[PDB]
Amino acid sequence: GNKVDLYGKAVGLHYFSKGNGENSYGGNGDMTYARLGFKGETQINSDLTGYGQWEYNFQGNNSEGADAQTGNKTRLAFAGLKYADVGSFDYGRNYGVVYDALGYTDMLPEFGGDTAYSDDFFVGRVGGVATYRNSNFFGLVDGLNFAVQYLGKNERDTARRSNGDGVGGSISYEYEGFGIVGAYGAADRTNLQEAQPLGNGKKAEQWATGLKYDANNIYLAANYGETRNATPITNKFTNTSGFANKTQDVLLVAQYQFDFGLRPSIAYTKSKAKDVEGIGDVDLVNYFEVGATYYFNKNMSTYVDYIINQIDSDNKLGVGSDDTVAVGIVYQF
Amino acid sequence: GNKVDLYGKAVGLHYFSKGNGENSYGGNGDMTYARLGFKGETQINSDLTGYGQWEYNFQGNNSEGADAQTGNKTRLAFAGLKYADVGSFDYGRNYGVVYDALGYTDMLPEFGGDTAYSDDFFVGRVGGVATYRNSNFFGLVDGLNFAVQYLGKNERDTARRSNGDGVGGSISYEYEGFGIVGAYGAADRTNLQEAQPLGNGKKAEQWATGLKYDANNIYLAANYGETRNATPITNKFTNTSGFANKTQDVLLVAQYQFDFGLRPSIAYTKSKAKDVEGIGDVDLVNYFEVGATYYFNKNMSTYVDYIINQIDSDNKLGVGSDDTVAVGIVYQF
Amino acid sequence: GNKVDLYGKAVGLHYFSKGNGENSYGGNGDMTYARLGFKGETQINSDLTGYGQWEYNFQGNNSEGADAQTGNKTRLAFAGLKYADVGSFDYGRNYGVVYDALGYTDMLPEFGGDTAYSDDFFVGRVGGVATYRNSNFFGLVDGLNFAVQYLGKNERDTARRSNGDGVGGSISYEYEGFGIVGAYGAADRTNLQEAQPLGNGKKAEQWATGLKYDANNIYLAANYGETRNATPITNKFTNTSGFANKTQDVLLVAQYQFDFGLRPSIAYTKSKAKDVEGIGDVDLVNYFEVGATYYFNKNMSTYVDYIINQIDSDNKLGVGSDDTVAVGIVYQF
């Protein structure tokens, strides 16, 4: 009793931004890519299931010469066991447990989910996490789920992609279409992260809450959160980098799914950094979004996503101020 | 109604050239490799189909240490829609539209197709092309096909793999075994390509025609074409590089497919560069070919391909003059 | 009549060693990874089969930034034909023919098989080998198998991953649960390998014998062998490297497979280098092993593997002296 799906997609994708767009939200040019993965689950006995998943990203916008591997990576690689009502345990490269909140708004046709950074403690995909999850409180409270996650230190060659040991968890409750969630994690920073000019402190912290309504073809969600010493940043003026001492983040989304397959979307996102060395307060992300995806069926879709960028041109860190529109065509299986 | 094929091959492949063969057509040594891809198509309704394809090359002749990734790349990555008789549209990394002509002779057991360079405007696979294709003139003229293709600028880190914006197209007509085709495209060159010592001008151009007979187990084809500022070249003496101001190219092939599975092949190819800075005229490619593939069935084959190289030893750009023979064994699915 | 299996596994894997473990057997930290491959065989006729295989390793312990590709590689890539009782021939990247002996002890839950180095002449996976194998002596002697293998020179950018031309072979005999095997190969060393400070001589040689009992849920095996100028080594003091002039190697393993799925393991391995320039004799590997794998079924397992490391802290080459324990969870298909 094993079921394994090989799965994947090919995404023709193009970004339009003015001139460069070295000063835009998303950039400019061909951004085509493809994903390949497997996900499998085996029924060991009536109460026990083993499972594994691996997912890889292959850029489609590189040449076949020396730059062939740019932006190619494993996204996920983990395996786990799930026991009757006791919970599931998995270990590997997987989603940070703060993403249990951030996933609420990470729903846009192309962009969005800006604070769910990869290899960034608990907000995005990350290496070496052991994750325990429980559904419906051991089978006793329908709708009430929680998780705890242990993050092992990754002392890598850059501060940006490193972390120390840490712990995080999440609790959520869902009831006839509504959902609420909170997630928090904290971890040591490594000596290399500390040596960065930007950000100061021995612990990283990230938290977020989420509210959503997801029924009757309507999708509405909001996320609010803060981080300490955890959001990666760069000052394009001094070419210095590191982490924001604090940030406060808000993300809102509203979508509707029409039976004929159109799914319009609007959204707002703002992330503001505070106590940044040599700057003080400074916006990281600030935009409105209008977009749509058209689903032809479960295997084919197309979309447009427009980021009306509200970052101003005198942003003190050099964050791009121009708009970006993406257009995509997607075959997936 | 989705059909997706995972497909691939493992190719044990060895090249024999004298000494190095640093001065040969093809080189020398192990050239084993494998390909993995998917290709999928979904029937959206009776008249509309969505489709996607991704294909990757994994060299099999690298070690498992630092050189593990040499020559590994995505070859194709695109998705598209095809509507009743109106045409097909796809976007991504795909074959340049001049390959609609060059494919006629790109038929040898191992070598051949020399002017179908990758990441070279319209002659080979290339990034960021939007391609429209029409079969049988909207359903009105059986056998008459055309295409137009829009190439978005790729300002990459090398001249060799860069291009500016451009447009190309092709028209072909097939009738009881005979086929004729023409294709032309033109594009801006980028500032980096212009700064190269070899080749001068603001536009690249490539064109080719093709004639073939493909029936009764016979395959015969010829391609003639020219390029301006588009064929990549190197002078091994001065170690300078760039593009040939002009080239003129001819490719001929003849093959026969015996029912017992042997498919012998002979061929001629010559590509000559003109107005090369500091040289004038100079051959790029000039050889005869004799070879065969033996098909055991649709999944297994073996072949030998011998390139009787007619480049002379005093070639002014340093183009290799020695012969090369390849021997391959292929399992594919 | 083609059968192709896509296959793979996701392995959550963690190593525990004291402090660094820069001075341990196995290291420390997340070592998660995934494998993807295909293996196919086509029945050409009643007596002839074609076959191909490709296998790749994707690390799961890298970040998605610049280090994304570390430790990623093709492990195997070859294709072949197998004729009735005459034998099989394949060419590509495959197991060196000395591994026909070393495979006997390469059976531990995580570690073990220490002398089966990759890209190391005939002991491990290697590029450009043509391998002929015969089962049951042409169909005439049940249980008696042999092989010969031709290794083409690989002049790569490092000594460690290079080799010259060579030949190796193996002969084995199996009879109601017992097996005996011998394998030997020799090859030229390349000029780059010769220029290394460690190891001196024009030929590499590697041989090994094996004995095993494999029946009634018992597994016992021993391997003994020697090498000349073939085992790669480093002196962490002088930061010099190359090959051991000689080594002598022994590997023992004993395991039991309980019907309920537990498979305990114990093992001993010692590899000693001799005539090392500026040192004389020096241990390379010396440990005992205790471990177990628990198989839930054919798709799911977990294991622990503990290396009681007997290398001392004053080892003259700087070989790590500390212990390592690994813990893994594996989903495979």
Side-chain angles (χ1 to χ4, degrees):
Chain A
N2 189 46
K3 290 154 204 223
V4 208
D5 198 22
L6 185 94
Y7 63 90
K9 53 178 171 197
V11 184
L13 179 53
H14 198 96
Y15 286 9
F16 301 91
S17 304
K18 83 142 101 301
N20 254 290
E22 204 203 287
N23 188 59
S24 69
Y25 172 77
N28 176 257
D30 181 36
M31 299 291 282
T32 296
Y33 66 92
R35 303 274 171 72
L36 191 78
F38 60 73
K39 36 168 231 206
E41 98 173 36
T42 177
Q43 200 66 47
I44 298 172
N45 60 48
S46 51
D47 290 330
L48 179 60
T49 289
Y51 55 89
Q53 179 170 189
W54 164 77
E55 186 168 279
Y56 194 89
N57 180 77
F58 291 105
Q59 290 289 327
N61 65 343
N62 296 331
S63 102
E64 298 189 28
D67 54 304
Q69 300 294 316
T70 302
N72 288 16
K73 57 252 178 194
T74 287
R75 288 166 43 97
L76 299 176
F78 59 84
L81 293 168
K82 180 180 256 171
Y83 188 48
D85 274 305
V86 174
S88 68
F89 172 85
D90 47 67
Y91 182 69
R93 183 181 181 80
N94 208 344
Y95 281 89
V97 68
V98 185
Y99 189 78
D100 287 355
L102 296 177
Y104 267 32
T105 54
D106 184 18
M107 289 289 286
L108 298 208
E110 174 58 19
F111 296 115
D114 309 61
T115 72
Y117 303 98
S118 299
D119 306 298
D120 189 28
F121 296 94
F122 303 92
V123 295
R125 294 180 302 276
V126 60
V129 280
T131 311
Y132 168 80
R133 299 177 167 284
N134 182 296
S135 268
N136 303 307
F137 199 70
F138 302 97
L140 310 165
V141 183
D142 298 338
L144 173 60
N145 290 0
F146 71 93
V148 55
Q149 179 176 76
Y150 296 90
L151 172 61
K153 161 183 36 118
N154 294 302
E155 295 222 124
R156 300 196 191 282
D157 289 355
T158 61
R160 161 73 178 79
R161 301 293 172 166
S162 299
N163 56 276
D165 290 346
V167 184
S170 76
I171 300 172
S172 74
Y173 179 65
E174 294 189 10
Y175 186 68
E176 306 180 339
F178 292 82
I180 184 165
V181 57
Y184 170 77
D188 301 337
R189 310 171 85 235
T190 61
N191 293 347
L192 191 65
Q193 295 181 311
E194 213 87 26
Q196 299 304 296
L198 311 175
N200 174 59
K202 265 174 149 91
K203 263 168 29 212
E205 304 181 71
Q206 290 159 325
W207 63 269
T209 68
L211 302 77
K212 70 173 171 147
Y213 180 75
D214 179 4
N216 302 115
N217 305 313
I218 298 157
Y219 193 85
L220 304 174
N223 273 125
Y224 179 69
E226 297 184 12
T227 65
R228 296 292 144 94
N229 301 325
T231 298
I233 57 177
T234 302
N235 176 346
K236 270 159 175 168
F237 296 121
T238 64
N239 230 335
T240 68
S241 75
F243 297 82
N245 278 304
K246 301 161 35 182
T247 73
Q248 301 165 219
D249 305 325
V250 53
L251 300 104
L252 310 175
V253 178
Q255 309 181 335
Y256 192 81
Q257 182 65 61
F258 286 101
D259 287 358
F260 67 92
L262 188 60
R263 187 192 182 86
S265 173
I266 55 176
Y268 172 71
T269 298
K270 179 166 180 202
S271 171
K272 187 200 303 178
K274 289 148 107 72
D275 306 325
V276 171
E277 25 299 67
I279 283 160
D281 300 2
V282 57
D283 281 353
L284 292 187
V285 180
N286 193 339
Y287 66 69
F288 295 83
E289 180 261 354
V290 55
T293 303
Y294 185 87
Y295 293 96
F296 310 81
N297 56 22
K298 75 172 152 64
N299 299 105
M300 200 78 209
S301 63
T302 183
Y303 53 81
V304 183
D305 209 354
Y306 176 26
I307 296 291
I308 305 155
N309 192 353
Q310 307 288 297
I311 294 286
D312 44 57
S313 40
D314 50 358
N315 173 290
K316 315 283 147 134
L317 285 175
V319 181
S321 45
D322 287 332
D323 294 351
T324 295
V325 186
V327 181
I329 177 168
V330 176
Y331 170 80
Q332 61 186 87
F333 70 93
Chain B
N2 189 46
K3 290 154 204 223
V4 208
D5 198 22
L6 185 94
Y7 63 90
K9 53 178 171 197
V11 184
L13 179 53
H14 198 96
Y15 286 9
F16 301 91
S17 304
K18 83 142 101 301
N20 254 290
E22 204 203 287
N23 188 59
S24 69
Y25 172 77
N28 176 257
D30 181 36
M31 299 291 282
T32 296
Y33 66 92
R35 303 274 171 72
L36 191 78
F38 60 73
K39 36 168 231 206
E41 98 173 36
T42 177
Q43 200 66 47
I44 298 172
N45 60 48
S46 51
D47 290 330
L48 179 60
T49 289
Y51 55 89
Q53 179 170 189
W54 164 77
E55 186 168 279
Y56 194 89
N57 180 77
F58 291 105
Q59 290 289 327
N61 65 343
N62 296 331
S63 102
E64 298 189 28
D67 54 304
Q69 300 294 316
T70 302
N72 288 16
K73 57 252 178 194
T74 287
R75 288 166 43 97
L76 299 176
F78 59 84
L81 293 168
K82 180 180 256 171
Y83 188 48
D85 274 305
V86 174
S88 68
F89 172 85
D90 47 67
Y91 182 69
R93 183 181 181 80
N94 208 344
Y95 281 89
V97 68
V98 185
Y99 189 78
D100 287 355
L102 296 177
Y104 267 32
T105 54
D106 184 18
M107 289 289 286
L108 298 208
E110 174 58 19
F111 296 115
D114 309 61
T115 72
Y117 303 98
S118 299
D119 306 298
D120 189 28
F121 296 94
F122 303 92
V123 295
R125 294 180 302 276
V126 60
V129 280
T131 311
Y132 168 80
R133 299 177 167 284
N134 182 296
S135 268
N136 303 307
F137 199 70
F138 302 97
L140 310 165
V141 183
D142 298 338
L144 173 60
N145 290 0
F146 71 93
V148 55
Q149 179 176 76
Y150 296 90
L151 172 61
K153 161 183 36 118
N154 294 302
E155 295 222 124
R156 300 196 191 282
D157 289 355
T158 61
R160 161 73 178 79
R161 301 293 172 166
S162 299
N163 56 276
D165 290 346
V167 184
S170 76
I171 300 172
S172 74
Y173 179 65
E174 294 189 10
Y175 186 68
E176 306 180 339
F178 292 82
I180 184 165
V181 57
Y184 170 77
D188 301 337
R189 310 171 85 235
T190 61
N191 293 347
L192 191 65
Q193 295 181 311
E194 213 87 26
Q196 299 304 296
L198 311 175
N200 174 59
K202 265 174 149 91
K203 263 168 29 212
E205 304 181 71
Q206 290 159 325
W207 63 269
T209 68
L211 302 77
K212 70 173 171 147
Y213 180 75
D214 179 4
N216 302 115
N217 305 313
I218 298 157
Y219 193 85
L220 304 174
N223 273 125
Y224 179 69
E226 297 184 12
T227 65
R228 296 292 144 94
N229 301 325
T231 298
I233 57 177
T234 302
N235 176 346
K236 270 159 175 168
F237 296 121
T238 64
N239 230 335
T240 68
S241 75
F243 297 82
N245 278 304
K246 301 161 35 182
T247 73
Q248 301 165 219
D249 305 325
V250 53
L251 300 104
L252 310 175
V253 178
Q255 309 181 335
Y256 192 81
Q257 182 65 61
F258 286 101
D259 287 358
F260 67 92
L262 188 60
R263 187 192 182 86
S265 173
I266 55 176
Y268 172 71
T269 298
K270 179 166 180 202
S271 171
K272 187 200 303 178
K274 289 148 107 72
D275 306 325
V276 171
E277 25 299 67
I279 283 160
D281 300 2
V282 57
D283 281 353
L284 292 187
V285 180
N286 193 339
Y287 66 69
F288 295 83
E289 180 261 354
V290 55
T293 303
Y294 185 87
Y295 293 96
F296 310 81
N297 56 22
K298 75 172 152 64
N299 299 105
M300 200 78 209
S301 63
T302 183
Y303 53 81
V304 183
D305 209 354
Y306 176 26
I307 296 291
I308 305 155
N309 192 353
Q310 307 288 297
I311 294 286
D312 44 57
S313 40
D314 50 358
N315 173 290
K316 315 283 147 134
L317 285 175
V319 181
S321 45
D322 287 332
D323 294 351
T324 295
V325 186
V327 181
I329 177 168
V330 176
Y331 170 80
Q332 61 186 87
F333 70 93
Chain C
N2 189 46
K3 290 154 204 223
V4 208
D5 198 22
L6 185 94
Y7 63 90
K9 53 178 171 197
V11 184
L13 179 53
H14 198 96
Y15 286 9
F16 301 91
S17 304
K18 83 142 101 301
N20 254 290
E22 204 203 287
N23 188 59
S24 69
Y25 172 77
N28 176 257
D30 181 36
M31 299 291 282
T32 296
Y33 66 92
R35 303 274 171 72
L36 191 78
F38 60 73
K39 36 168 231 206
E41 98 173 36
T42 177
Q43 200 66 47
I44 298 172
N45 60 48
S46 51
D47 290 330
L48 179 60
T49 289
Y51 55 89
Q53 179 170 189
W54 164 77
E55 186 168 279
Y56 194 89
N57 180 77
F58 291 105
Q59 290 289 327
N61 65 343
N62 296 331
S63 102
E64 298 189 28
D67 54 304
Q69 300 294 316
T70 302
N72 288 16
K73 57 252 178 194
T74 287
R75 288 166 43 97
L76 299 176
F78 59 84
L81 293 168
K82 180 180 256 171
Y83 188 48
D85 274 305
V86 174
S88 68
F89 172 85
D90 47 67
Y91 182 69
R93 183 181 181 80
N94 208 344
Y95 281 89
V97 68
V98 185
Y99 189 78
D100 287 355
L102 296 177
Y104 267 32
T105 54
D106 184 18
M107 289 289 286
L108 298 208
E110 174 58 19
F111 296 115
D114 309 61
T115 72
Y117 303 98
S118 299
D119 306 298
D120 189 28
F121 296 94
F122 303 92
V123 295
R125 294 180 302 276
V126 60
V129 280
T131 311
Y132 168 80
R133 299 177 167 284
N134 182 296
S135 268
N136 303 307
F137 199 70
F138 302 97
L140 310 165
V141 183
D142 298 338
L144 173 60
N145 290 0
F146 71 93
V148 55
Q149 179 176 76
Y150 296 90
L151 172 61
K153 161 183 36 118
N154 294 302
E155 295 222 124
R156 300 196 191 282
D157 289 355
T158 61
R160 161 73 178 79
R161 301 293 172 166
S162 299
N163 56 276
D165 290 346
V167 184
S170 76
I171 300 172
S172 74
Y173 179 65
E174 294 189 10
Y175 186 68
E176 306 180 339
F178 292 82
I180 184 165
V181 57
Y184 170 77
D188 301 337
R189 310 171 85 235
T190 61
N191 293 347
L192 191 65
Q193 295 181 311
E194 213 87 26
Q196 299 304 296
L198 311 175
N200 174 59
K202 265 174 149 91
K203 263 168 29 212
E205 304 181 71
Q206 290 159 325
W207 63 269
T209 68
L211 302 77
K212 70 173 171 147
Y213 180 75
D214 179 4
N216 302 115
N217 305 313
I218 298 157
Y219 193 85
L220 304 174
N223 273 125
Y224 179 69
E226 297 184 12
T227 65
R228 296 292 144 94
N229 301 325
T231 298
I233 57 177
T234 302
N235 176 346
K236 270 159 175 168
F237 296 121
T238 64
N239 230 335
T240 68
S241 75
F243 297 82
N245 278 304
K246 301 161 35 182
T247 73
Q248 301 165 219
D249 305 325
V250 53
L251 300 104
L252 310 175
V253 178
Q255 309 181 335
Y256 192 81
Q257 182 65 61
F258 286 101
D259 287 358
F260 67 92
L262 188 60
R263 187 192 182 86
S265 173
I266 55 176
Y268 172 71
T269 298
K270 179 166 180 202
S271 171
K272 187 200 303 178
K274 289 148 107 72
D275 306 325
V276 171
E277 25 299 67
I279 283 160
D281 300 2
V282 57
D283 281 353
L284 292 187
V285 180
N286 193 339
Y287 66 69
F288 295 83
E289 180 261 354
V290 55
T293 303
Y294 185 87
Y295 293 96
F296 310 81
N297 56 22
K298 75 172 152 64
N299 299 105
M300 200 78 209
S301 63
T302 183
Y303 53 81
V304 183
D305 209 354
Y306 176 26
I307 296 291
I308 305 155
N309 192 353
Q310 307 288 297
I311 294 286
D312 44 57
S313 40
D314 50 358
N315 173 290
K316 315 283 147 134
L317 285 175
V319 181
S321 45
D322 287 332
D323 294 351
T324 295
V325 186
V327 181
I329 177 168
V330 176
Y331 170 80
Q332 61 186 87
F333 70 93

